[PDB]
Amino acid sequence: SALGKLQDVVNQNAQALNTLVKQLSSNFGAISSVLNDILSRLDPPEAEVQIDRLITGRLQSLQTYVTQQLIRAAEIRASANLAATKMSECVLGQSKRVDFCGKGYHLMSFPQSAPHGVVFLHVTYVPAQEKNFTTAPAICHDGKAHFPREGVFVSNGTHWFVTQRNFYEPQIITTDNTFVSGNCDVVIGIVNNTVYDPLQPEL
Amino acid sequence: QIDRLITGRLQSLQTYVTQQLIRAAEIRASANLAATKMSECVLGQSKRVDFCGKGYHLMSFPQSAPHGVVFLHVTYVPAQEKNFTTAPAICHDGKAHFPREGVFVSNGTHWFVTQRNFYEPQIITTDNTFVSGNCDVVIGIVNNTVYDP
Amino acid sequence: YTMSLGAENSVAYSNNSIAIPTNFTISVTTEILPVSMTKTSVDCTMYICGDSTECSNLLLQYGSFCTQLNRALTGIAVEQDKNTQEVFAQVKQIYKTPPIKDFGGFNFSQILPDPSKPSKRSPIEDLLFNKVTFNGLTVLPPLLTDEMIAQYTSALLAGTITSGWTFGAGPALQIPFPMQMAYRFNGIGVTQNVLYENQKLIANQFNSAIGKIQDSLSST
Amino acid sequence: TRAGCLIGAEHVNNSYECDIPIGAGICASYQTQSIIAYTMSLGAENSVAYSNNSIAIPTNFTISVTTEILPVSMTKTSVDCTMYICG
Amino acid sequence: LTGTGVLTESNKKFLPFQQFGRDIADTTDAVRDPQTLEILDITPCSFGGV
Ligand SMILES: *[C@@H]1O[C@H](CO)[C@@H](O[C@@H]2O[C@H](CO)[C@@H](O)[C@H](O)[C@H]2NC(C)=O)[C@H](O)[C@H]1NC(C)=O
Ligand SMILES: *[C@@H]1O[C@H](CO)[C@@H](O[C@@H]2O[C@H](CO)[C@@H](O)[C@H](O)[C@H]2NC(C)=O)[C@H](O)[C@H]1NC(C)=O
Ligand SMILES: *[C@@H]1O[C@H](CO)[C@@H](O[C@@H]2O[C@H](CO)[C@@H](O)[C@H](O)[C@H]2NC(C)=O)[C@H](O)[C@H]1NC(C)=O
Ligand SMILES: *[C@@H]1O[C@H](CO)[C@@H](O[C@@H]2O[C@H](CO)[C@@H](O)[C@H](O)[C@H]2NC(C)=O)[C@H](O)[C@H]1NC(C)=O
Ligand SMILES: *[C@@H]1O[C@H](CO)[C@@H](O[C@@H]2O[C@H](CO)[C@@H](O)[C@H](O)[C@H]2NC(C)=O)[C@H](O)[C@H]1NC(C)=O
Ligand SMILES: *[C@@H]1O[C@H](CO)[C@@H](O[C@@H]2O[C@H](CO)[C@@H](O)[C@H](O)[C@H]2NC(C)=O)[C@H](O)[C@H]1NC(C)=O
Ligand SMILES: *[C@@H]1O[C@H](CO)[C@@H](O)[C@H](O)[C@H]1NC(C)=O
Ligand SMILES: *[C@@H]1O[C@H](CO)[C@@H](O)[C@H](O)[C@H]1NC(C)=O
Ligand SMILES: *[C@@H]1O[C@H](CO)[C@@H](O)[C@H](O)[C@H]1NC(C)=O
Numbered sequence: 277s278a279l280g281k282l283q284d285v286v287n288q289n290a291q292a293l294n295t296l297v298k299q300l301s302s303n304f305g306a307i308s309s310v311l312n313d314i315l316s317r318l319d320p321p322e323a324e325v326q327i328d329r330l331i332t333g334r335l336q337s338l339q340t341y342v343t344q345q346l347i348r349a350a351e352i353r354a355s356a357n358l359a360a361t362k363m364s365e366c367v368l369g370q371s372k373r374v375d376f377c378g379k380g381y382h383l384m385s386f387p388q389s390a391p392h393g394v395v396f397l398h399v400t401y402v403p404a405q406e407k408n409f410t411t412a413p414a415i416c417h418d419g420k421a422h423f424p425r426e427g428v429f430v431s432n433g434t435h436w437f438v439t440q441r442n443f444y445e446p447q448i449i450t451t452d453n454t455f456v457s458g459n460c461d462v463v464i465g466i467v468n469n470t471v472y473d474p475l476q477p478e479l
Numbered sequence: 480q481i482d483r484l485i486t487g488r489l490q491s492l493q494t495y496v497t498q499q500l501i502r503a504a505e506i507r508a509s510a511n512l513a514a515t516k517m518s519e520c521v522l523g524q525s526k527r528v529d530f531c532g533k534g535y536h537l538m539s540f541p542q543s544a545p546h547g548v549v550f551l552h553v554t555y556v557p558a559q560e561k562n563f564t565t566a567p568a569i570c571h572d573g574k575a576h577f578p579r580e581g582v583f584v585s586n587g588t589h590w591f592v593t594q595r596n597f598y599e600p601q602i603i604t605t606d607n608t609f610v611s612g613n614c615d616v617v618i619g620i621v622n623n624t625v626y627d628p
Numbered sequence: 629y630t631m632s633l634g635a636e637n638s639v640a641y642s643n644n645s646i647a648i649p650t651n652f653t654i655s656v657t658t659e660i661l662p663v664s665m666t667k668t669s670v671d672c673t674m675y676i677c678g679d680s681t682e683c684s685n686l687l688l689q690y691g692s693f694c695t696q697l698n699r700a701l702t703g704i705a706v707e708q709d710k711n712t713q714e715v716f717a718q719v720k721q722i723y724k725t726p727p728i729k730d731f732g733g734f735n736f737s738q739i740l741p742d743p744s745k746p747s748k749r750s751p752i753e754d755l756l757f758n759k760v761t762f763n764g765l766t767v768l769p770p771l772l773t774d775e776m777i778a779q780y781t782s783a784l785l786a787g788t789i790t791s792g793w794t795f796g797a798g799p800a801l802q803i804p805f806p807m808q809m810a811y812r813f814n815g816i817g818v819t820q821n822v823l824y825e826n827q828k829l830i831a832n833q834f835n836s837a838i839g840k841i842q843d844s845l846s847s848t
Numbered sequence: 849t850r851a852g853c854l855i856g857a858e859h860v861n862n863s864y865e866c867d868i869p870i871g872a873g874i875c876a877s878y879q880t881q882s883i884i885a886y887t888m889s890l891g892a893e894n895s896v897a898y899s900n901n902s903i904a905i906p907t908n909f910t911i912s913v914t915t916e917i918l919p920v921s922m923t924k925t926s927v928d929c930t931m932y933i934c935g
Numbered sequence: 936l937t938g939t940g941v942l943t944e945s946n947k948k949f950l951p952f953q954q955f956g957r958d959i960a961d962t963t964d965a966v967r968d969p970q971t972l973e974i975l976d977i978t979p980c981s982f983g984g985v
């Protein structure tokens with residue numbers, strides 16, 4: 277039942293078609309639902325009346341069918357356009373759009389053929405086990421405010437590390453992992469730490 | 480006479496249903512757009528221009544409304560700017576230096592490298608730039624001093 | 629008159645000249661989208677013939693015409709719940725803000741639900757609510773009532789404020805609000821140090837920008 | 849209830865995620881035995897431990913593959929009205 | 936004036952020459968009784984899907 281969207285469109289169109297042909301059994305006020313039972317039983321001027329009732333009824337039935345198919349086709353067009361967009365953006369590329377191609381961080385996708393439609397297998401990265409760390413917007417060194425170059429400054433309770441935002445892989449805070457902007461008296465919540473300079477032990 | 484009223488009333492009902500159905504498609508399209516806006520601008524940060532307000536999207540907050548959704552789009556909008564001269568590259572010692580990030584600009588006497596969406600001059604250093612090619616290729620290259628830390 | 633398209637504004641273009649912003653503002657704009665419509669459903673038999681037997685017997689000569697109309701309207705009514713759920717029910721859990729609304733100077737009081745009211749809607753939602761207003765037919769209720777939509781909205785807001793975008797792509801992960809903003813600034817090409825240096829200003833521009841929303845919605 | 853008069857279902861004060869929707873916030877389900885009526889839950893309550901100096905960072909991750917099904921086309925059907933209407 | 940529905944008394948006031956009430960939808964919703972000069976509201980017989 278998971279693959280229900282394609283089954284529903286197949287059944288919905290099949291039903292509309294069956295509905296149309298069943299209207300041929302209606303008389304729409306005519307003496308008979310059967311065209312031959314009008315023509316063979318009534319004199320021409322009378323037959324011409326009963327036949328117009330069937331024509332009007334059947335024509336109206338067909339117009340209804342076509343209108344519903346035409347509106348439905350627009351719905352399908354919209355879906356097809358979305359499917360075309362997802363393939364070009366998620367199969368032929370890597371989407372940056374949240375929940376566009378699955379929950380989580382999009383990595384890639386694979387198209388699959390399906391009757392009257394397309395199925396996409398969306399491969400996403402989803403964060404799992406997590407922990408709380410103490411954080412700070414900046415670190416104060418020699419009176420200067422240091423901000424993470426790409427990551428967040430966090431503490432395990434005794435030591436401060438710079439960690440990539442989406443995965444806990446802590447590193448020693450060095451002058452390569454941080455940039456300096458302004459002094460320690462501006463940033464709210466700045467903490468005191470030591471920023472390592474790789475040159476010092478080699479100088 | 481009854482048959483005539485049936486035709487007229489059935490026809491007016493068909494008109495109602497057809498127009499209601501066409502409008503339903505319009506509402507559905509709007510709902511789909513609303514769903515996209517929420518998932519991309521509320522549950523994420525959109526990079527799409529004017530998708531969620533004028534300016535550079537920061538965040539948004541949905542609010543409930545009768546038969547719809549209202550989004551408060553919070554955007555960063557640049558304010559009062561200044562005219563600076565610029566150069567695509569700087570020549571130091573036979574080598575062309577390009578900014579790693581930002582743009583090289585001058586206040587009329589000194590060259591600085593700064594980010595594009597906010598004026599905040601930095602000293603041009605070897606840690607703010609990278610080298611590619613010599614000084615005889617880039618059109619508009621200017622002569623300056625790049626500081627080696 | 630012949631309408632103006634806009635003010636004329638030439639750009640001071642030159643091959644060696646660039647303009648760079650020296651300041652910024654935080655702008656909040658409001659975008660309104662329809663999600664659903666009234667689930668109106670009318671019975672074709674009653675609409676056309678009422679309780680008349682003589683008429684109903686002739687209506688049957690039209691076969692499935694009434695069946696088709698009743699089904700079309702049913703389908704329209706059903707997708708109204710689908711539209712509402714697709715837009716609002718994007719969060720698996722119901723998130724709530726802490727007792728202490730300390731977000732680094734950022735004031736969300738007009739955004740978050742007012743707990744003192746019988747219907748827990750924000751000051752802005754309350755305003756939005758107030759601003760917009762037999763013959764065989766009936767009107768069906770929605771699956772999700774105003775109360776439930778408000779709760780979904782609250783969950784989304786609480787998530788956005790205390791977790792950021794992480795709750796929409798995995799588990800919710802708390803982050804200090806001003807730090808979340810710093811990431812959002814970095815995400816638009818503005819170095820994160822800008823926000824911290826100007827955190828007081830940004831929070832104030834934000835707070836004013838929100839107050840103006842409630843006023844412009846009420847006024848216009 | 850607001851949706852209508854529901855007969856045969858037992859109303860309870862315990863909310864559950866919605867199974868069979870009725871309307872106006874009411875859903876029904878089969879418990880194990882009887883059918884019950886309840887106000888639907890919108891999801892589990894989850895308060896994040898927000899603090900001005902606390903951040904949660906994932907230490908592990910999973911690769912999730914989800915399936916999205918979209919229709920592309922409908923039956924390519926047509927009818928000749930001059931045969932359908934007449935014969 | 937004919938129809939099917941439920942007759943109830945109501946706190947509605949008609950002018951002395953008005954025989955029945957009509958809604959915005961051209962639907963009769965009240966009638967002045969021909970013998971007793973009082974106003975009765977008319978509501979439809981309850982119906983709905985099952
Ligand atoms: C924070 O991380 C540091 C390591 O960077 C931990 O210190 C080490 O702990 C191990 C035992 O697990 C010792 O063998 C090492 O010698 C320690 N190294 C140093 C430099 O002290 C520290 O214990 C962690 N703190 C907390 C609260 O978990
Ligand atoms: C980080 O360390 C510095 C010292 O290196 C602290 O500076 C002191 O601040 C107090 C309060 O204004 C002054 O009375 C002291 O005289 C300052 N010390 C010096 C040497 O000037 C700073 O407060 C510390 N910050 C944090 C968050 O711990
Ligand atoms: C361009 O910026 C530099 C500074 O980066 C300006 O030079 C400084 O001017 C101040 C006075 O306002 C002096 O106290 C500093 O000692 C100067 N520094 C240096 C290195 O000279 C410079 O004047 C600015 N140029 C223009 C045209 O505005
Ligand atoms: C940047 O500096 C270099 C010198 O390092 C300049 O090169 C000189 O250009 C003149 C004019 O064509 C020649 O006559 C000299 O012989 C060149 N010097 C050398 C060592 O080759 C260069 O023109 C300067 N660029 C700018 C824009 O001022
Ligand atoms: C958040 O903003 C609201 C205003 O939108 C503040 O509420 C006002 O507080 C002042 C007192 O300073 C009262 O005189 C106003 O009548 C209040 N207005 C409303 C609508 O309640 C609220 O105090 C701010 N929150 C914080 C923590 O500063
Ligand atoms: C950047 O712009 C902001 C306003 O958007 C300036 O802040 C205002 O400064 C005026 C004084 O000129 C005060 O009266 C206002 O109350 C301030 N508004 C706020 C929200 O603080 C800010 O000074 C400007 N900064 C720079 C460097 O130009
Ligand atoms: C965050 O800290 C709270 C205690 O304040 C704890 O209950 C919660 O489980 C922690 N989060 C994680 C991911 O461990
Ligand atoms: C965080 O909140 C505590 C109060 O619990 C306060 O003392 C501290 O200064 C705050 N830190 C920041 C960065 O706002
Ligand atoms: C830049 O210079 C032009 C004149 O060439 C002037 O019209 C424009 O206003 C200046 N822009 C700024 C930001 O000063």
Ligand SMILES: *[C@@H]1O[C@H](CO)[C@@H](O)[C@H](O)[C@H]1NC(C)=O
Nearest residue numbers: 565566567618619620643644
């Ligand atoms: C800009 O144009 C002038 C000619 O008007 C030319 O001398 C100069 O070198 C050009 N600068 C750049 C960066 O193209």
Ligand SMILES: *[C@@H]1O[C@H](CO)[C@@H](O)[C@H](O)[C@H]1NC(C)=O
Nearest residue numbers: 858859860861862863886887
């Ligand atoms: C269920 O809630 C109703 C109020 O709506 C209350 O009268 C009834 O006693 C409650 N039943 C139980 C078992 O708690």
Ligand SMILES: *[C@@H]1O[C@H](CO)[C@@H](O)[C@H](O)[C@H]1NC(C)=O
Nearest residue numbers: 951967968969970971972973
């Ligand atoms: C009709 O006669 C009755 C007495 O049987 C009287 O009470 C009533 O008011 C009369 N109504 C009118 C309109 O004359």
